[PDB]
């Protein structure tokens, strides 16, 4: 991996202090290197690894995550997705993040249209 960037085995991880929206966060990483996308965590051994990177790079914890929560619906039980609705509305569609909780690292829900730090990740 390049300078300032970390390394696991086949992917590189890094942390950015400059707070930006979730959108430009995905478009930013997309530039760095090839296949470069938002940091992903699909394994404990992979999570505990990042729990140390965002601990030495920053003092606190406030950054985006490649996870795409939000309500919506990939597709109704039938086939067609959720185009039109009529619910009572009560906060649902949000984008996950990550903040300390007197332990490792837990992901919370936050507005996708907000401005917070993030991460980048690309394969070797």
């Amino acid at each position: 991996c390049p300078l300032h960037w970390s390394s696991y085995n086949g992917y590189c991880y890094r942390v950015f202090s400059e707070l930006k929206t979730w959108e430009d966060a995905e478009s930013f990483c997309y530039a760095q290197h090839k296949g470069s996308r938002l940091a992903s965590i699909h394994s404990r051994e992979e999570e505990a690894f990042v729990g140390k990177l965002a601990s030495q790079t920053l003092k606190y914890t406030s950054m985006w995550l490649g996870l795409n929560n939000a309500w919506a619906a990939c597709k109704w039980e039938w086939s067609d997705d959720a185009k039109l609705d009529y619910k009572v509305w009560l906060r649902r569609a949000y984008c996950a993040v990550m903040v300390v909780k007197t332990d490792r690292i837990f992901w919370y829900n936050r507005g996708c249209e907000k401005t917070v730090s993030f991460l980048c990740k690309f394969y070797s």
Binding site: H42, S43, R44, E47
Partner: protein, 132 residues
């Protein structure tokens, strides 16, 4: 009888492959055959030995790390959890992180062992089905 290439022991057919694929694609591969079934399954300590031969002897006895018919998880309606009252699972709150294990058959000598591995890994596998 078992198709061309597929072996047998009494009423079951076995036949591995070389095309390395993930767990999902593997379990989604065998099912797409003339006889809808699943991956390899070792129910007794007698079969685990048979599946070992038709696995090595056909794979140049090379140290393989084939997949298996195991997929444990503590999430969704497929979570390996149940309640005493008999009520279904509609809510949880476990400290441990939501995992997704996909064991395998790491062979070293004689009989292959079973060890957990990232479901998103590329290794070999083997199908299996029961004759009508």
């Amino acid at each position: 009888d078992c198709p061309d290439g597929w072996s047998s022991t009494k009423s079951y057919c076995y036949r591995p492959f070389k095309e390395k694929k993930t767990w999902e694609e593997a379990e989604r591969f065998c099912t797409e055959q003339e006889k809808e079934a699943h991956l390899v399954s070792m129910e007794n300590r007698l079969e685990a030995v048979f599946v070992d031969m038709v696995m090595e002897n056909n794979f140049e006895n090379k140290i393989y790390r084939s997949w298996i018919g195991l997929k444990i998880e503590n999430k969704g309606q497929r979570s390996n959890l149940e309640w005493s009252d008999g009520s279904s699972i509609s809510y949880e709150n476990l400290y441990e992180p939501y995992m997704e294990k996909c064991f395998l058959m790491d062979h070293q000598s004689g009989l292959p062992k079973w060890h957990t591995a990232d479901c998103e890994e590329k290794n070999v596998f083997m199908c299996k089905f029961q004759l009508p």
